[PDB]
Design a protein around this ligand. Structure first.
Ligand SMILES: C=CC1=C(C)[C@@H](Cc2[nH]c(/C=C3N=C(/C=C4\NC(=O)[C@H](C)[C@H]4CC)C(C)=C\3CCC(=O)O)c(CCC(=O)O)c2C)NC1=O
Ligand SMILES: C=CC1=C(C)[C@@H](Cc2[nH]c(/C=C3N=C(/C=C4\NC(=O)[C@H](C)[C@H]4CC)C(C)=C\3CCC(=O)O)c(CCC(=O)O)c2C)NC1=O
Ligand SMILES: C=CC1=C(C)[C@@H](Cc2[nH]c(/C=C3N=C(/C=C4\NC(=O)[C@H](C)[C@H]4CC)C(C)=C\3CCC(=O)O)c(CCC(=O)O)c2C)NC1=O
Ligand SMILES: C=CC1=C(C)[C@@H](Cc2[nH]c(/C=C3N=C(/C=C4\NC(=O)[C@H](C)[C@H]4CC)C(C)=C\3CCC(=O)O)c(CCC(=O)O)c2C)NC1=O
Ligand SMILES: CCC1=C(C)/C(=C/C2=NC(=C\c3[nH]c(/C=C4\NC(=O)[C@H](C)[C@H]4CC)c(C)c3CCC(=O)O)/C(CCC(=O)O)=C2C)NC1=O
Ligand SMILES: CCC1=C(C)/C(=C/C2=NC(=C\c3[nH]c(/C=C4\NC(=O)[C@H](C)[C@H]4CC)c(C)c3CCC(=O)O)/C(CCC(=O)O)=C2C)NC1=O
Ligand SMILES: CCC1=C(C)/C(=C/C2=NC(=C\c3[nH]c(/C=C4\NC(=O)[C@H](C)[C@H]4CC)c(C)c3CCC(=O)O)/C(CCC(=O)O)=C2C)NC1=O
Ligand SMILES: CCC1=C(C)/C(=C/C2=NC(=C\c3[nH]c(/C=C4\NC(=O)[C@H](C)[C@H]4CC)c(C)c3CCC(=O)O)/C(CCC(=O)O)=C2C)NC1=O
Ligand SMILES: CCC1=C(C)/C(=C/C2=NC(=C\c3[nH]c(/C=C4\NC(=O)[C@H](C)[C@H]4CC)c(C)c3CCC(=O)O)/C(CCC(=O)O)=C2C)NC1=O
Ligand SMILES: CCC1=C(C)/C(=C/C2=NC(=C\c3[nH]c(/C=C4\NC(=O)[C@H](C)[C@H]4CC)c(C)c3CCC(=O)O)/C(CCC(=O)O)=C2C)NC1=O
Ligand SMILES: CCC1=C(C)/C(=C/C2=NC(=C\c3[nH]c(/C=C4\NC(=O)[C@H](C)[C@H]4CC)c(C)c3CCC(=O)O)/C(CCC(=O)O)=C2C)NC1=O
Lengths: 96, 172, 162, 44, 231, 162, 172, 172, 172, 162
């Protein structure tokens, strides 16, 4: 059945799989939905969050996407980043 | 750990940004839910021993092998440690409910729990049934209107039951 | 994070306990203060570049040797003025983060921890940043309990540098 | 007294030997004061 | 006279400084009798020491040492003697020492008394012969009298897992009770009343875990409980 | 005792800290909720004798063997009936001590620490005291957030006995 | 350690009494003094580095024997401890201001401090001079009406000054 | 740990042999250049803060994304941990220069450092750039004659440059 | 640890059974030959120093490459550690002789010992030779008829020989 | 080991500090002494075969029961006589190891650690080795400060046996 009751949240249904299925008001985890982006301080190429300012390590644990049980955790052991570049000639000639 | 107001600050800093007026206006929508969030953890804390023992009684009525001689919840020291696990998980889902996100639940409770149960020989798929029976005992308690003013807290019920879902898929 | 929420979870988890009314009242006091504390962050963000370029000029007035003396540590070049207004905006942005969180969380992690070791190595005098924060403390224009929230985090930053 | 927190406790014979050896370096800072007259074109 | 054998160190968090004036919420709550606690606050020192040495699952009524507690309340023993008295206690020998070997018992007592992980595998090999030749009473005395214990905890602080989280991060190292339980993959097999070692998830014909979809009327249920007032 | 004020000092003394806005907001949440909990302690004090004699009679209707079975543990003599209404008054008095202080501090020190060795030795049943506390929860006559404060400390005593 | 609300509860349990209505109504007067009490504590904690440094610098101006070679403030390791000892006492006085009674000032700061200073050779009368110079540096700041509603809070500055006298007679 | 002389004895004990005449004369060659080896480590530790703070300043001008928002040396704690690690690496290199072998550098500094940096997200190839900047800032200073008698100690400088190269390849 | 009596109990508790009459009668047969079991560990303990030092002396006569330079028993510390390993194993065999089963031998002594010797570089096959040299040395003592009434202990001696044999295959 | 170089690194590393002039003065005292220690280690090596057999014959004169009494622990058989001179050569080799390193480092790990368990188990009297070491101290043939370095590690091995 659809999630109808607020009483069946504990009985039958678990939580929204994708964030387009969230409750009226909130994100997929259940917290309030806030827009991701604020005003950037210090617009500047050399000193400022440019396009290639490297990612915060604390952006994932703050997300909760580093823990394996939470849905944000993507495992990269089977994705294309873990496949060998065949254009590398050290890897082609060895594997020929 | 992070709460829900600290999760937006860590995303904003990672790109060296201020917070826009659209982001502040979404954080004062989280403040206005403040008294209904405190009623939900108060109803879970105040009934916390009936959540645990009514749902453990239900767990052994329909899986009676766990308390037979040779089972895992046999020999009352392992029965007492079994009820300890359910109070522990209920404690951290209660922590993640006032915080607004599950990061204190993720690394202080669930981190390494699936691999702990495999080293003990504890059926981790039956621990997930134990968490799922505390899930709707806690939801039926939070939908219950006794002691509360009229109004609305239905997006918060769906959020509390999502921390019980995260705790139950991390253990199987 | 030194939020009143995460400080409440920590005192309950120190003794392995559920959240009683001792800890729900600490969370409730954050929500009663979050109204004035969020209008301060909205008004400091909207006047960000006015307060940053003003506070940089107030350091060059009180310390005019910082624009003349040669060397990498001073604002005597075009790169040294870009890195100086970068640092005023760092101290301003951490204040506004503390106003949307409640309590001195982001300032301790991102700004104060390790600041004394940096200001010794790169020869950055902490009296410059005190003068820059005293300008923002006098020129943000807020009043009532909204300035009372704002100045409590300008003053917290000055006590770490002092 | 050397500096206001650092001192020399010497006998009245050997306190003459401390003062008449730094007046023996006060006659060579009267001799490097002619290093200002030859500021330009020194060794040509 | 058989000195201990030499092992190599390893890079860890606690070997190096955190430049953290004003710690936050992950600071880990010094429990000390140097703050002169009352009777209600010396109960919290005792529960923190039980949780650190035993598990949370071994703070049963049959486990608590009521006479070691009353010598701490009268200032006869220090907290270093309370921690030593819990390791040489009869519940710790029965529930933990008897179901581990000598190498896994060293890494339990390094993690819980010194508050840090082992440096390498050879450190377990180096300390497990202190147990086999002098007993538990000689092993816990040479472990509490290291400079690692007397500098960090002294003799009046309860130990804790030293430097578990890095100040920026939200995901820190695993807690030492979830990382090292009572017994491991050996003694699991049949020496601890166990069968079949795994279990598939519970099947059912009423599915119980259906994910909501985009037109379901419970996602709009929000204000269904009550309409807002006004005109 | 664990109060909201001594739990804000202890978390600030652990960090070597002055009282920041994290801690001032937590003490302010105590002062906001103290209006609703000081009238619950005033209304439970003034109607205490109606609640003690009522709650002891509610045990006797529910477990009537405690008035008939001979022995020193039971309320069958006149001595053993005054020791019952003594104990109901002890539990009601600790609940009023927690409402004026805020937080489950007085009954953590005076009542629950060592309680299980008392019930085991003298053969007292903790379900007699749950039935007495469930009467007081349903019969104190409070309403609103005044009943919310009182019932939160009744349920703490039940959860230590259950 | 105790606050003022648990001081009156520890005295009622020792005689087995409920609190009378006069003790309740004397406690709710302390609650409505609560916003004025948090103003005084905020006014001290935000000037804390200047209370310590000015009253230190005013102490080695009138007592130059402390920092003269051979004194008990010479050799900067001892100078760093004199500034720590001033900051500790001002910290634990502001702790006893939000509490309402000096039970946290007494045990975990002041119990054994005359005994400690006599063991080291610290002049305990000079410490009492420095404590009374942070008293009138922070009594003067709590009487400052900058950014407050102008009301009357003269009864809490006479309370805050008493905790400084309590720490000053306890080291001599 | 071992030094250079104790390394030779450890080779000779495992064969059960006395030392030969040529192994004695090779050891008396290390004694002869002892004052030139002590003069190098004195030249390096006397400028140890300037080696670190200038090799870091050249690194953040070459790789400017490390101090941009999101970069690995962007905050005051991440900036101070970077200068900490360069000072640790330079400290154990100075230890390995008086010993004569890299036994203390491998065991007490480098063991597990690569796996520590992978778990943190710290770019290990950037740490190697900052160690090579400390290498030629120390080699150029060890070749400076101001204060030493004139002579050729280029074999010792090629040994010091190998400890820096050892730590540079053992971090990535 | 378990003895022979608690081994039957722990197996019976996992089935939820009382002990059968043939299990009590097999237990009371152990009690009947209990005096002859105590005479065996009286002979072994009283000569325990001579069992270790005579079989270690015979191990290096027939394996002379253990004590040559480079060998595993060549130094003062590596040789005295070989002697105490024999005294540990001989001690835990006598613990398995009065208990009746090899539960203290397996848990306290033999668990994880093969992998420890592989990490140390100790030749595990030669440790088995030293255990077998202690086996027949203590069997020859167990069959001594001095200070005893003459009877048949041959099933008990064949049990002591099985404890040394279990220790010798659990170490290679 | 116990080289002066490793015993200077171990004090600087304990504080987590660089090498100051306190450590470089310590290592300089090793280098100003090693011209006598390395002439003593070469002079004992080149006269070893005279010194081993002379010291082994000296304990047969002092204790003649070793060459007569049966048992594996005595030098009455050709097996026992080859193991006796093997032991004298083990003591002289660790002496010359300690001279080229400086300080009693090599003979601690290789000869002293666990020595008391060897002499107790195999019933070797430590007064046999003291008579052998007193022969080498008498007739190594050295003089001056060369003989002072050799007798410093002879008497260290005597002090551990005595
Ligand atoms: C001391 C700790 C502490 C608490 C326990 C809460 C308790 C609490 N809840 C509410 C107030 C409320 N609480 C609820 C909650 C509910 N009503 C329902 O019908 C649902 C069953 C349930 C949500 C699941 C609602 C709907 C309101 C008020 C309406 C609103 O705020 O919009 C109020 C009054 C706020 C007001 O007057 O607006 C208080 C004090 N707050 C605290 O500080
Ligand atoms: C989050 C932190 C936090 C604070 C800092 C305070 C801030 C604060 N103070 C006051 C309100 C007040 N504060 C003070 C205190 C003072 N005024 C003076 O003139 C003196 C200088 C000083 C006392 C020595 C007084 C006296 C009032 C009431 C106005 C009056 O009657 O004079 C109020 C309004 C509520 C009321 O009327 O009680 C608030 C919010 N509260 C908080 O929750
Ligand atoms: C107690 C602290 C202590 C020190 C800090 C060092 C410093 C030091 N170096 C030398 C002496 C010397 N030092 C050098 C070294 C150099 N000369 C150069 O031209 C290069 C720049 C550099 C090589 C890298 C040389 C070449 C000599 C003289 C010859 C030699 O020692 O071999 C001497 C005197 C010995 C002599 O004259 O030979 C001293 C004391 N030694 C110490 O004992
Ligand atoms: C607490 C100290 C203590 C001990 C050390 C043992 C030793 C011991 N065993 C026996 C008693 C015995 N001991 C043996 C043992 C043997 N006979 C043999 O021919 C074999 C050589 C050897 C077995 C290996 C036998 C067979 C008996 C039974 C007496 C008999 O058969 O006449 C007795 C006398 C009791 C009796 O006569 O039954 C004693 C003291 N028992 C103890 O209580
Ligand atoms: C704070 C976060 C935290 C968690 C979550 C945690 C779990 C945890 N549960 C454990 C044991 C246990 N867990 C169970 C639980 C169960 N067995 C069953 O059959 C049921 C399906 C289930 C619950 C009803 C049992 C019976 C044991 C005892 C294992 C034993 O010692 O035999 C242990 C083993 C350590 C010990 O018992 O001393 C840990 C570490 N520990 C923690 O510190
Ligand atoms: C988010 C927290 C945070 C802070 C506070 C921070 C400060 C900071 N300021 C720095 C440099 C600097 N800061 C200045 C700023 C000034 N000098 C002057 O003369 C002016 C008076 C003054 C401007 C007010 C200058 C000129 C440098 C360059 C110094 C050098 O490179 O040696 C550096 C060295 C690296 C760099 O940015 O180039 C750090 C780490 N970094 C941080 O991540
Ligand atoms: C302030 C904290 C505190 C608590 C909780 C407390 C309980 C307490 N209840 C007791 C006895 C008792 N309690 C009861 C009460 C009951 N039995 C019944 O049958 C009724 C159903 C029930 C009344 C509701 C009785 C009959 C005894 C006497 C037991 C005996 O004398 O053997 C005793 C034995 C000593 C005595 O009072 O005579 C203690 C210590 N004492 C304390 O100081
Ligand atoms: C419970 C909290 C707590 C307190 C109260 C405390 C006091 C304390 N102050 C101390 C020292 C000190 N205190 C002073 C202070 C002064 N000397 C003067 O002449 C001035 C008058 C005054 C500064 C205004 C000095 C100079 C020392 C160092 C004494 C020494 O080491 O010789 C010491 C000795 C340890 C040390 O040398 O640092 C203790 C234990 N320590 C604590 O942990
Ligand atoms: C055995 C001796 C020893 C070493 C060397 C050691 C290193 C070490 N460096 C660390 C972090 C770090 N290391 C760096 C270093 C760098 N990041 C960069 O971008 C630069 C390329 C580079 C140096 C300039 C930074 C920035 C952190 C901590 C912040 C973070 O990574 O989140 C940490 C994590 C814990 C902490 O941050 O305090 C350890 C344990 N630990 C040890 O015990
Ligand atoms: C579970 C009960 C238990 C046992 C049995 C045990 C044995 C044990 N034997 C060890 C070493 C050793 N054991 C030997 C023994 C031998 N090597 C040989 O060549 C001979 C064949 C044999 C003697 C018969 C040696 C040579 C070492 C290493 C000594 C060293 O590396 O310095 C060590 C390493 C500790 C050390 O370095 O001293 C352990 C832990 N540990 C335990 O906890
Ligand atoms: C490198 C450090 C080191 C030392 C010091 C050392 C001593 C040593 N001497 C031994 C035996 C022995 N040592 C002797 C020597 C003597 N007995 C006498 O009566 C003579 C007076 C005296 C000769 C001077 C004899 C006869 C044995 C054989 C004892 C036996 O096998 O039971 C043994 C037993 C194994 C063997 O070598 O056969 C050791 C381990 N081993 C070492 O690895």
């Amino acid at each position: 059945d659809k999630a109808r009751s607020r009483s069946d949240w504990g009985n039958r249904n678990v939580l929204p799989a994708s964030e387009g299925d969230a409750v009226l008001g909130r994100t997929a985890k259940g917290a309030v939905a806030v827009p991701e982006f604020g005003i950037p301080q210090l617009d500047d190429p050399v000193l400022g969050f440019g396009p290639d300012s490297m990612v915060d390590p604390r952006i994932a644990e703050a997300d909760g996407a580093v823990w394996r049980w939470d849905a944000g955790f993507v495992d990269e052991s089977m994705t294309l980043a873990s496949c060998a570049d065949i254009s590398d000639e050290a890897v082609a000639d060895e594997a020929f | 750990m992070l709460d829900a107001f600290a999760k937006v600050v860590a995303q904003a800093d990672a790109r060296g940004e201020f917070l826009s007026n659209t982001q502040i206006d979404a954080l004062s929508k989280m403040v206005k839910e403040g008294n209904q969030r405190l009623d939900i953890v108060n109803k879970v804390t105040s009934n916390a021993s009936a959540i645990v023992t009514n749902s453990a009684r239900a767990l052994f009525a329909e899986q009676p092998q766990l308390i037979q001689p040779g089972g895992n919840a046999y020999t009352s020291r392992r029965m007492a440690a079994c009820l300890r696990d359910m109070e522990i998980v209920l404690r951290y889902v209660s922590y993640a409910m006032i915080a607004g996100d599950s990061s204190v639940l993720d690394d202080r409770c669930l981190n390494g729990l699936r691999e702990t149960y495999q080293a003990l020989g504890t059926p981790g798929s039956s621990v997930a049934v134990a968490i799922q029976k505390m899930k709707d005992a806690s939801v039926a308690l939070a939908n219950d209107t006794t002691g509360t003013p009229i109004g609305d807290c239905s997006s918060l019920v769906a959020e509390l039951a999502g921390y019980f879902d995260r705790a139950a898929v991390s253990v199987v | 994070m030194k939020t009143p929420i995460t400080e409440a979870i920590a005192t309950a988890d120190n003794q392995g306990r559920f959240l009683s009314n001792t800890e729900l009242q600490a969370v409730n006091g954050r929500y009663q203060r979050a109204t004035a504390s969020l209008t301060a962050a909205k008004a400091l963000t909207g006047s960000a570049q006015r307060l940053i370029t003003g506070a940089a000029q107030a350091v060059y007035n009180k310390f005019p040797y910082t624009t003349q003396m040669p060397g990498p540590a001073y604002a005597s070049s075009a790169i040294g003025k870009a890195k100086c207004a970068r640092d005023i905006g760092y101290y301003l942005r951490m204040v506004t983060y503390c106003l949307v969180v409640g309590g001195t969380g982001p300032m301790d992690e991102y700004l104060v921890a390790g600041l004394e070791e940096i200001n010794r190595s790169f020869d950055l005098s902490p009296s410059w940043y005190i003068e820059a924060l005293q300008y923002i403390k006098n020129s943000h224009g807020l009043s009532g309990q909204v300035a009372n929230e704002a100045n409590a985090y300008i003053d917290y930053a000055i006590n770490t540098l002092s | 007294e050397i500096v206001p927190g650092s001192y020399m406790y010497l006998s009245p014979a050997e306190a003459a030997e401390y003062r008449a050896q730094q007046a023996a370096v006060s006659q060579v800072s009267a001799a490097f004061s002619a290093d200002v007259q030859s500021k330009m074109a020194q060794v040509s | 006279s058989i000195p201990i054998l030499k092992y190599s160190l390893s890079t860890q968090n606690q070997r190096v400084e955190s430049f953290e004036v004003n710690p936050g919420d992950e600071q880990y709550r010094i429990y000390s009798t140097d703050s002169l606690p009352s009777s209600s606050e010396v109960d919290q020192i005792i529960w923190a020491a039980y949780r650190q040495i035993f598990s949370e699952h071994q703070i049963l009524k049959s486990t608590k040492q009521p006479f070691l507690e009353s010598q701490l309340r009268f200032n006869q023993i220090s907290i270093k003697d309370f921690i030593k008295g819990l390791v040489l206690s009869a519940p710790f020998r029965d529930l933990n020492y008897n179901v581990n070997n000598n190498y896994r018992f060293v890494e339990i007592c390094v993690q819980r008394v010194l508050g840090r992980d082992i440096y390498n595998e050879r450190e377990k090999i180096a300390w497990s012969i202190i147990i086999a030749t002098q007993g538990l009473e000689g092993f816990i005395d040479t472990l509490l009298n290291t400079q690692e214990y007397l500098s960090n905890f002294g003799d009046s602080i309860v130990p804790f897992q030293r430097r578990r989280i890095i100040p920026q991060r939200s995901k820190g190292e695993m807690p030492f009770n979830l990382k090292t339980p009572r017994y491991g993959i050996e003694f699991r097999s049949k020496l601890a009343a166990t069968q079949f070692s795994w279990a598939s998830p519970i099947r059912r014909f009423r599915p119980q875990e259906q994910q909501p979809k985009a037109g379901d009327p419970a996602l709009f249920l929000n204000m269904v409980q009550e309409m807002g007032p006004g005109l």
